[PDB]
Amino acid sequence: DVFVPDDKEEFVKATILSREGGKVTAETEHGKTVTVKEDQVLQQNPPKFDKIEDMAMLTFLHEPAVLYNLKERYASWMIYTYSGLFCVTINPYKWLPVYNAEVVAAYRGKKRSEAPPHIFSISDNAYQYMLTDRENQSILITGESGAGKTVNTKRVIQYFAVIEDQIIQANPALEAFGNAKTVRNDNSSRFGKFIRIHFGATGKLASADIETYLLEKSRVIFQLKAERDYHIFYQILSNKKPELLDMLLITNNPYDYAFISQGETTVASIDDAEELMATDNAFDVLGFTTEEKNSMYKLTGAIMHFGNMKFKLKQREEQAEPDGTEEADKSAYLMGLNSADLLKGLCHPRVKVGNEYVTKGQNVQQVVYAKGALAKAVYERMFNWMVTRINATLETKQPRQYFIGVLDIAGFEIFDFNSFEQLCINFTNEKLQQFFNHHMFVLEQEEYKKEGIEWEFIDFGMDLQACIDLIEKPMGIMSILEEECMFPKATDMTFKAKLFDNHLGKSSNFQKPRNIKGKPEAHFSLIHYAGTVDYNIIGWLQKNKDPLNETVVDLYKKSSLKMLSSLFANSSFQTVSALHRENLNKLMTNLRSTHPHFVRCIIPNETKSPGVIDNPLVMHQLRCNGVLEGIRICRKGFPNRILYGDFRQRYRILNPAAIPEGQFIDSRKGAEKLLGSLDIDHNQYKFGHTKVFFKAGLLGLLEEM
Amino acid sequence: TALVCDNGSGLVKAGFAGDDAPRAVFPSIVGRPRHQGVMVGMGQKDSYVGDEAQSKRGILTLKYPIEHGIITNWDDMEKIWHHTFYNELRVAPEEHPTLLTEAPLNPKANREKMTQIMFETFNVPAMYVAIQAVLSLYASGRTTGIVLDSGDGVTHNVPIYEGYALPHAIMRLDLAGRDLTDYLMKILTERGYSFVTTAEREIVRDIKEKLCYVALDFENEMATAASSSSLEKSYELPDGQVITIGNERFRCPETLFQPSFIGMESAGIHETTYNSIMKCDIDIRKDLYANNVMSGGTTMYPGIADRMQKEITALAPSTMKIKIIAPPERKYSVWIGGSILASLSTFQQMWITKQEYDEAGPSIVHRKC
Ligand SMILES: Nc1ncnc2c1ncn2[C@@H]1O[C@H](COP(=O)(O)OP(=O)(O)O)[C@@H](O)[C@H]1O
Ligand SMILES: [Mg+2]
């Protein structure tokens, strides 16, 4: 009973006849009898440790453990499984009595290790914490709709409301401006929408307000050629409901425009052709006047419609004249404001002085950058104002003050041909893991403190800080792009030259890949915990340059109600990096003022066969999600949560005997002679409060015999 | 497919075994900045190599690390090796046998340490330096004759009969290609122009590249261009000026045919090659006169073939046929032959694998070549 590094999965159960010299002879679960390398052969945890709902009690805590245990438990059609603080579900798709009414009011206690693995339990325990500590709680959903999750919190929220349906109604519409098909695992809502439900001191639901975080603002332009833009763009594309297109003056052809033509616009798997009816219907019944209703279309179209703008290089000079008056004019009518002053404010923006003379200066390249910047900003702020309106139709006036918030975030991203966008998203995803590590460290710190003997290494967060500094800390990586766009003559290669000069060897996490087999050549690589990342920095200088031109902003006030309403409410040339860092700090602050808990989602396979595992995928998601990193934390450390009585009970094979279940050396009579049976290292375990943590792994062999 | 990379001082040319054309060729300049850095954040490169360095000579000083077939200031020539392997040809040496090139006899210590430097750091699998002329011979498919490559750093002759490299008549000469440029500096000072610095000194070889044709009966052509203004030619620097070169046009290359101008007291190349002819048997002269092959660079000057034919037929007894082989594949014949030699399967056994070097010590190159 051992584990073998088989070719396909490298973490599957094995069967050793024996092992010799460096080459293990073994009959594998994956296939037939084979010979394999010793060093990566791992050892199976004992039956008493084996098949435990928590993945924190398995002596050889290594990755194979959590792999096979998930494989078996889901093989037996179990879906709820505990993995340290993390909770893991697979949510099969052929109906099972999963939402049975018996459990709905059932798990009203049983903090986390007193009931069968189940997350409604932990959410209800969060309810109890609310009752006791009167302090906010946060749901940490990993994985996106691309991970098959959508059907979980839609039920969990109703569960929490049990001890109302307006919450979902936002989803169908806000998806259209937020779902974006990617290279891998398509059709993912890439925008973060923290969702909170407010309770007063009483506990009856008063309201639930929703605020989005860290929307992907650079998806609007320079999308990858392989991928596709926001769903709404192709919703408007399809001729269905052509009257709104008649309002919007669009020709109904994707490839006409610059922004769209980067996209594929032909995704046979899912198009909004049918969905446009549902999105329009929700977008109406959510309390929208027809004027705002069609105005939303007006702005969304105009954001496309700039894509037709074309400029020429002036003679013997530098600034840009406008070409293509008619499309500028159609846009101008579409937003109402005059065309002539718009093109002029493009060609000669105003910059103030101690008294604001009409200062002037531009270049064609700057203009092509800036107009896109303006489009991106106006779209993002439009989206957030729609969030405000969704709050408006859901407004309340009760005393609501204490909320338990569910946040959905983009999942960890590792695949082919990853530019800036991936770096941003990955940084965001991993900061939350930094938050998790520090949190679990705090709680285990006080708990082990009650049993105080000695802590291994304070602040589990250092493991991530080692790369957090590299990504963000001044003159790190992200800072270099900020500096490089500013510096004159932005050239792509000079960027990487500077990076290699500044953080190679000097930074122990910045290295270079070699011959990435078929995927196009990445330039530089980083060693994250979850996966070494590879990027090519082409187009980065273009991506992050975005000058928020003022004159047009001030020009925007004298038009339709929406645009003035959006842009009236609200500098070192803000570039996506800085805005992004600041907003992420805002988010972590909001989580800094809360308490976490963890709900995960697992995809079985692309073939969508419920009830049956498929190893190629799940291993990647589990490694990416960082549950393996939490298991790494437990494995290298004390965290193996063990009753001292439990250890005295299980250890009777070295206290010569066979009979388990008590009635031999108990808690008070141990750590005296026991390790002297087979000479196990001392001080790896004691009893402070008769709760003992372990350097586990040494406890697997001793119970096999 | 091993590799072939020329050493010659002028243009380090890189390519692949078997291929008929060097994959990348670039001037061997090495550059350093000669002024302080003023616009903070440039991320200055501490040294530059090849055509990248040639691009911005404006603020650069130029060191040629290769003079007279001797590799000096080894640090920068190693820099050139490193730039070649990774940036131009773009493969790690770890998986490619490598062959180099070397003038006839330059010093003893040169190869004996160059093999070490290129064989210990670059960790190449195997290498074998081959003397220039015999390689030039294969390049043209003639296995009998005299080679006059005159690669920019050094000029030399070998007699090779029936594929035997008859040593003792090897007649080296340091009338290098660069020194024609350097003399042209002094001759161009007279027409009133001035080219003091190093960058302009690099330009002038370019201006030499087009406007130097060697002419028969030097005295008569000289008086001819003196009396008549027929050939008064023009050209422009990347400055805006236009420069008018008179008889210096055909007084440049004739320093080759007589060195009295440059000063060196060693006869012109035609007399040296005739000398090396007359220092062999009385039966090899029958064929040697017939297969005379130019090679290397610095002989793309128009006419030089014909002028050479005239001088030799005047010197040799007027009963032999001196028809000299000057293909226009010159300036690369070194490299073509090198690739062909690397392509020979029987040649595979020759060169030196790492085992021999490690177990024998550095002298293995001299002992086994
Ligand atoms: N247009 C030209 N006409 C005549 N000679 C030239 C021309 N261009 C370059 N050369 C000469 O060719 C020389 C290169 O020869 P060399 O370096 O000795 O051979 P290799 O490049 O094979 O090592 C340069 O020094 C230059 O003087
Ligand atoms: Mg050369």
Coordinates of C-alpha atoms in Angstrom, one line a residue, chain A residues 483-484 487-488 494 497-498 501 514, chain B residues 39-45 90 92:
Chain A
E483 CA 8.2 54.0 -14.7
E484 CA 8.7 52.6 -18.2
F487 CA 10.1 57.3 -19.7
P488 CA 10.5 58.5 -23.2
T494 CA 14.2 47.8 -23.2
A497 CA 16.5 44.6 -20.5
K498 CA 15.8 46.7 -17.5
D501 CA 19.5 44.3 -15.1
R514 CA 13.6 27.6 -21.6
Chain B
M39 CA 19.5 61.1 -18.7
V40 CA 18.8 59.0 -15.6
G41 CA 17.0 55.8 -16.3
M42 CA 18.6 54.8 -19.5
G43 CA 19.7 51.5 -18.1
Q44 CA 22.9 51.8 -20.0
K45 CA 24.5 48.7 -21.5
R90 CA 21.0 31.6 -31.2
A92 CA 23.7 27.1 -26.8

